[PDB]
Design an enzyme around this catalytic site. Structure first.
Site, short mmCIF file in Angstrom:
data_model
loop_
_atom_site.label_atom_id
_atom_site.label_comp_id
_atom_site.label_asym_id
_atom_site.label_seq_id
_atom_site.Cartn_x
_atom_site.Cartn_y
_atom_site.Cartn_z
N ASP A 172 -8.65 -4.21 -3.98
CA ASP A 172 -8.42 -3.48 -2.74
C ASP A 172 -8.23 -1.98 -2.96
OD1 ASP A 172 -8.62 -5.90 -1.36
OD2 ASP A 172 -6.46 -6.30 -1.55
N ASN A 182 -5.98 0.78 5.99
CA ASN A 182 -4.89 -0.21 6.12
C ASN A 182 -3.84 0.24 7.11
OD1 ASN A 182 -4.44 -1.68 2.74
ND2 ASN A 182 -5.83 -2.22 4.41
N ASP A 183 -3.15 1.32 6.77
CA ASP A 183 -1.92 1.67 7.46
C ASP A 183 -1.44 3.08 7.22
OD1 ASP A 183 -1.05 1.25 4.74
OD2 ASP A 183 -0.48 -0.80 5.26
N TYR A 191 0.85 -4.35 4.09
CA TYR A 191 2.29 -4.15 4.26
C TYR A 191 2.81 -4.84 5.53
CZ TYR A 191 6.64 -1.48 3.17
OH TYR A 191 7.91 -1.06 2.80
N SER A 192 2.09 -4.69 6.63
CA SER A 192 2.50 -5.28 7.91
C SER A 192 2.80 -6.78 7.79
CB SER A 192 1.42 -5.00 8.96
OG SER A 192 1.78 -5.53 10.21
N1 LIG Z 1 3.91 -5.51 0.99
C1 LIG Z 1 4.73 -4.54 0.60
O1 LIG Z 1 5.95 -4.68 0.47
C2 LIG Z 1 4.02 -3.19 0.37
C3 LIG Z 1 2.65 -3.14 0.54
N2 LIG Z 1 1.94 -1.94 0.34
C4 LIG Z 1 0.48 -1.97 0.58
O2 LIG Z 1 -0.33 -1.44 -0.52
C5 LIG Z 1 -1.50 -0.95 0.16
C6 LIG Z 1 -2.35 -0.15 -0.84
O3 LIG Z 1 -3.15 -1.06 -1.62
P1 LIG Z 1 -3.44 -0.74 -3.19
O4 LIG Z 1 -4.02 0.61 -3.30
O5 LIG Z 1 -4.13 -1.92 -3.78
O6 LIG Z 1 -1.96 -0.61 -3.80
P2 LIG Z 1 -1.09 -1.79 -4.57
O7 LIG Z 1 -1.75 -2.32 -5.80
O8 LIG Z 1 0.32 -1.07 -4.84
O9 LIG Z 1 -0.58 -2.88 -3.59
C7 LIG Z 1 -1.46 -3.52 -2.81
C8 LIG Z 1 -1.14 -4.97 -2.83
O10 LIG Z 1 -1.52 -5.28 -1.49
C9 LIG Z 1 -2.83 -5.89 -1.51
N3 LIG Z 1 -3.58 -5.36 -0.35
C10 LIG Z 1 -3.97 -4.08 -0.16
N4 LIG Z 1 -4.63 -4.00 0.99
C11 LIG Z 1 -4.65 -5.22 1.53
C12 LIG Z 1 -5.17 -5.75 2.71
N5 LIG Z 1 -5.82 -4.97 3.60
N6 LIG Z 1 -5.00 -7.06 2.95
C13 LIG Z 1 -4.36 -7.85 2.10
N7 LIG Z 1 -3.85 -7.39 0.97
C14 LIG Z 1 -3.98 -6.08 0.67
C15 LIG Z 1 -3.43 -5.48 -2.86
O11 LIG Z 1 -4.45 -6.42 -3.22
C16 LIG Z 1 -2.20 -5.57 -3.75
O12 LIG Z 1 -1.84 -6.93 -4.02
C17 LIG Z 1 -0.88 -0.10 1.28
O13 LIG Z 1 -1.86 0.16 2.29
C18 LIG Z 1 0.21 -1.06 1.80
O14 LIG Z 1 -0.30 -1.85 2.90
C19 LIG Z 1 2.64 -0.77 -0.04
C20 LIG Z 1 4.02 -0.83 -0.21
C21 LIG Z 1 4.72 -2.04 -0.01
#
Ligand SMILES: NC(=O)C1=CN([C@@H]2O[C@H](COP(=O)(O)OP(=O)(O)OC[C@H]3O[C@@H](n4cnc5c(N)ncnc54)[C@H](O)[C@@H]3O)[C@@H](O)[C@H]2O)C=CC1
Ligand SMILES: NC(=O)C1=CN([C@@H]2O[C@H](COP(=O)(O)OP(=O)(O)OC[C@H]3O[C@@H](n4cnc5c(N)ncnc54)[C@H](O)[C@@H]3O)[C@@H](O)[C@H]2O)C=CC1
Ligand SMILES: NC(=O)C1=CN([C@@H]2O[C@H](COP(=O)(O)OP(=O)(O)OC[C@H]3O[C@@H](n4cnc5c(N)ncnc54)[C@H](O)[C@@H]3O)[C@@H](O)[C@H]2O)C=CC1
Ligand SMILES: NC(=O)C1=CN([C@@H]2O[C@H](COP(=O)(O)OP(=O)(O)OC[C@H]3O[C@@H](n4cnc5c(N)ncnc54)[C@H](O)[C@@H]3O)[C@@H](O)[C@H]2O)C=CC1
Lengths: 341, 360, 341, 360
Positions: free
Chosen positions: A117, A193-194, A236-237
């Site tokens: 991603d 994404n967000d 994140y959502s």
């Molecule tokens: N879930 C949480 O607690 C947090 C989530 N994020 C997400 O990380 C995203 C950035 O992605 P990366 O550059 O890969 O950073 P990353 O490697 O730090 O984290 C991303 C994680 O979210 C997954 N991901 C990313 N976009 C996705 C999507 N549209 N649908 C499902 N899973 C998805 C990635 O495969 C990875 O497992 C941000 O847009 C935010 O949404 C950021 C901070 C916290």
């Protein structure tokens, strides 16, 4: 291997998108032949490096007309990885086109990603305000959610793409307009994404005043808040308790991040919504697709709308039903309790 | 039908002219009458004094102030309220209050405007009448216990009706779902229309429903649960909300799929495209309880039928379904009060994001 | 096979329970030898029938002193399933003790279940107000949550049980006191999982006034409400959004079932709580461990407390950490998104 | 330390006698002083006028009405408030207001009663001082913006203090958690005590934490998330609530384990026995970001340290942990207002199960 400047290539040729009857997807029709293929990969990752070599080898073997574009530091990294020239004659080495970011942005017909991603998100962001070329995404290394294709099928998939037989999912993007108290103009950033606000390093909760189309919605005292595309609904959502939203739905998600409230149920807002969030009373971090932006002070604001240049991101799809399959097989959607063994 | 007063005459609604479909010039649509507004159908929440009183008071106002207006009510209501009018028009005994009535089909064909006096259920049942046809604009007054959908206090009825008839009102468009029931061993379908939702529930049965869900011809999941709800954005604040769903603006084109007490940790509510084709088949587990009446089907809260293992429902939006291989004005226009009814409704009626007590 | 009346056997002999240092569980010590073993099974189910035969055969082979007790209709069903008498001499047939429910209840030293959660719940309920003997539960057929043992290990497990080497998890129960407007006295029922009120067949929502220790908590308009033991926290309460509560926690769960509220967060109440729920304005169904009880009218009440005769249910445990293992492997607790393949 | 007034003398707190541990006769416990109440330690929310004003007013009342009472405050507070007293006792210039002060250890040993003037944070930091020892009874007055824990309006201070000193008050017992931090490459432990919670969070880092959780020596799960919170029942209404946790009565013996924005659809919050042994090790994914400062540790909201991959925390209740093979009065007594503070608090302060608007 021969490294050449990408500025020798014509500017980007646009593809045409048509919505065929009884399809959820947009037909990708090359009005001028596909030629400029930019390939990006997850860095410091053996499997993406090897797959890149193998993909480029395949392109040079099977598609003489195709020009391969990579980043400068990448061209240096992989030059030693090729050994056998085209059809084993020393007069056709592997031609890699490369150059400054802007040259690549100006000339790319198709963006190919090899990784997860993050690879897609950072590849797409590179384009800034230039309309984004179609994206062909292969999953390599650790799995993420967005890349629909296994690298093993790269020859068959690319053949459908270049031959105007492939279809794309259209993913909408948000635009973030940051207006800090101090200075004159907005900093504009696009999100696949967000866009989110978070206390981050601060032990103190954010206090955010949220407005929709000029009308006060609510004050939230919370870890933060996320504004997401349907694409971002699984990111994140989702972690914050949001619903899973098909990427075909026109909407903006507003999902609170740990709010001091029992009743901040996540919201699904119209595509055309104008969202303004004011930082109320370095207090608050701003991130776009996970990438930290400027820190915000009390009184700063973000303004968020859908991107309205062809807008959005067209991603080559595997099937009409990629979303169903992804939520089931990647996210474990509605996993049954164990009923046997 | 016998009137309970010489000051009221009950007349066949077929004496009235066919409906005048209004125009909707355009996030709200202006309601502009091409033919002048005349035929007003009025419904009320039954067995509640305030709404019977309001109906008589509203009809009295129409008869006093708008001679061109024709009042339509249900047959049992006509009889019910006939004794309630205590004077004829303009003190003239040769001008009784006229109430037009008849069978649904007769009423449906002639209504220019639906006026509801009651709550959410009143709107739902009123609109439900216009299932297979075009729905006239809906003017909704809240009486008795508050609901969510009626934007007007009945107190405001003169001023609001004035705006409506003079082509100065605006309406919010709300989309409708279609439920197609296909019984086991049948190739026919029973079609119903939903403003809020379509849901399946174990109901009286102590055992969980087992439901196989297909989207666009592809198998999504089997759920073992109390049931499942398919909702419009309008219905997102109804059963789906109670079951943990997101609040969806009625301007979003989407279908909600929300599980009802599922045996799963991971059935997160889904938001689907308005174009989606949804099929749900009633299943069972291998060697089991009874296979009949295992699930109840309801549409906008109205029980339709008990369903058996093997029955299926098909659910689509009224317009815009995309049928991938292997599978008259639309919607409902509700007169709105302000350009911000939605934000104010979720905040004030539902207590959206209520702050913890910060003072006093 | 010879069918004999169970009334020939002595009344139930009680086991002693001691909490050894650094254990979460209670040692099951037979103060008088174990003899009266009542075996129940999920009905109309081939695998439970065959397992019963096999278990009884094993008991008659290895434990002369053990008396096997089954239900009358079960004794008839399985009599034909035995063919070979003990050590192949026609003078020792398979002795099955049976008789009326009360005779079984009065004499049972150990309850053995062969089936799933329903089997345990209905076996335990049979005892009414008589203290419940220890429960040895084998999982057969479709999986449920409560039975810790695979039938295949039945010989080793039973040997630990009869030899006073086994340990039990103590599961608390709730008591439901139903007071209808019409009549004189309360109907009292015990719950291993839960007591719940639900609209059931009625399209109209329940309106429930909830009191804790005589103090008004809240009015809820909802599908219903569930009061659960920690054991019951994985049952209906979990479906309704409740937390997972270790069976070692002393507490009562109050979990709303689809409430007309954005803010009815599930509650965890003290073990000693007195809960009264009044039906406010055939309107409401009452169920105990899933079994429908009397229908309730406006003005009827339930009164719910923890059972305070040795109270509760002692279930033979496999390990000190059965709960962790069950939530992981049966319920899919915190399943990782797919990270490879 | 220099007083800003001749009407105030600042004296060493070591001039006072050792603490008198009270008796707690028994769902509330009666607070009965074995030795009479004398040494009153008062803390306030800093940099807020209302609490500085309240402190001066409270101390004035004690000095006027209870000659036997000795007032203890923080050293910086003593200096801060010294200029605020505008008269000596009983108009006698040879009887200045005396404020006792010194280092924490000195204060901790001599406090009979902790009085807090402020909000939830004020209680938390006040109790935090008594980490490795016995906590004196806590009398909490709400000033400024409302929180959840302080049961008394400062207006009521004379009547409430009267009840407390006369041995007529009752207290709710609240349990404490212990956090044992064991750094990578260390066999030593840093011990902290929690009234609300212990939590791990990605904080400043844009990447998710990867945490391996063990209960009673058995591996439970790996979570990839913003973080995780371990909470007392008191803390169930704090961070854990915001993260979707259940509301747990402070009379329930349990430890809450609540995920903070986990990358999972199935990390339902857990309620664990008070006897539980919890270990959380900071992990990472194979080939990654930085391995240092990847997670922040906070205890009752106070940042302790950034933690590195390989660090572990051990979390147990103050009393009653069961250590299965492979692994001084306790708790906090808070003066209560009524025998029903909890139900009234969740309803009135948190808006528990707020009804949708049914009238007006
Ligand atoms: N879930 C949480 O607690 C947090 C989530 N994020 C997400 O990380 C995203 C950035 O992605 P990366 O550059 O890969 O950073 P990353 O490697 O730090 O984290 C991303 C994680 O979210 C997954 N991901 C990313 N976009 C996705 C999507 N549209 N649908 C499902 N899973 C998805 C990635 O495969 C990875 O497992 C941000 O847009 C935010 O949404 C950021 C901070 C916290
Ligand atoms: N929340 C729950 O547990 C249940 C809700 N329902 C809802 O009842 C609806 C039928 O309405 P009635 O005929 O009034 O039966 P009703 O009076 O039994 O239920 C309606 C309750 O839901 C509210 N409601 C209905 N539609 C709503 C909407 N769009 N937004 C916000 N609140 C709404 C009503 O104001 C009333 O309080 C069904 O469409 C279904 O959505 C039906 C069963 C259970
Ligand atoms: N989740 C839902 O929507 C509903 C759940 N139930 C549950 O059914 C229980 C009765 O169980 P059965 O006699 O087997 O009837 P059953 O066969 O109708 O349903 C029980 C389902 O819940 C599982 N279950 C039962 N107790 C459990 C527990 N303590 N932890 C985890 N899973 C458990 C069973 O294995 C089975 O999958 C009731 O106590 C109630 O909790 C009843 C109605 C609805
Ligand atoms: N909800 C969230 O997003 C976050 C909550 N916190 C909480 O802040 C607590 C520290 O308190 P402060 O020093 O006041 O810092 P604070 O002022 O930054 O946060 C406290 C907020 O939580 C409320 N609060 C604290 N303890 C509570 C309890 N037991 N029940 C109900 N509400 C409570 C306070 O009244 C205040 O509104 C930490 O123990 C943690 O639980 C910390 C970070 C984020």
């Amino acid at each position: 291997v021969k490294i050449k400047p990408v500025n020798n290539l014509r500017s980007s040729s646009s593809a045409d998108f048509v919505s065929p009857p009884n399809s959820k997807l947009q037909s990708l029709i090359w009005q001028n032949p596909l030629q400029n293929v930019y390939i990006t990969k997850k860095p410091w990752t053996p499997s993406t490096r090897e797959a890149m070599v193998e993909f480029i080898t395949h392109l040079h073997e099977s598609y003489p007309e195709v020009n391969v574009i990579v980043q400068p530091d990448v061209a240096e990294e992989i030059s030693q990885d090729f050994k056998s020239p085209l059809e084993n004659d020393p007069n056709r080495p592997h031609i890699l086109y490369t150059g400054p970011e802007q040259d690549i942005v100006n000339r790319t017909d198709l963006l190919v990603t090899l990784g997860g991603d993050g690879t897609i998100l950072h590849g797409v962001s590179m384009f800034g305000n230039t309309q984004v070329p179609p994206v062909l995404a292969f999953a390599l290394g650790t799995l993420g959610f967005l890349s629909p294709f296994d690298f093993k099928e790269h020859k068959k998939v690319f053949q459908e793409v270049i031959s105007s037989r492939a279809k794309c999912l259209h993913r909408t993007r948000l635009e973030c307009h940051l207006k800090k108290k101090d200075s004159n103009s907005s900093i504009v950033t696009h999100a696949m994404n967000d866009i989110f606000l978070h206390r981050g390093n601060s032990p103190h909760l954010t206090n955010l005043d949220i407005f929709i189309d000029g009308e006060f919605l609510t004050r939230t005292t919370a870890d933060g808040v996320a504004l997401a595309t349907p694409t971002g609904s699984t990111a994140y959502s989702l972690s914050a308790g949001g619903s899973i939203v098909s990427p075909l739905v026109p909407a903006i998600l507003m999902t609170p991040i740990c709010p001091r409230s029992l009743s901040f149920r996540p919201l699904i807002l119209p595509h055309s919504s104008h969202i303004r969030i004011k930082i109320g009373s370095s207090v608050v971090k701003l991130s776009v697709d996970g990438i930290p932006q400027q820190d915000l002070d009390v009184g700063d604001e973000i303004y968020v709308i859908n991107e309205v240049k062809r807008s959005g991101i067209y991603c080559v799809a595997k099937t009409e039903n990629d979303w169903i399959r992804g939520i089931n097989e990647l996210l474990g959607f509605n996993s049954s309790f164990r009923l046997t063994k």
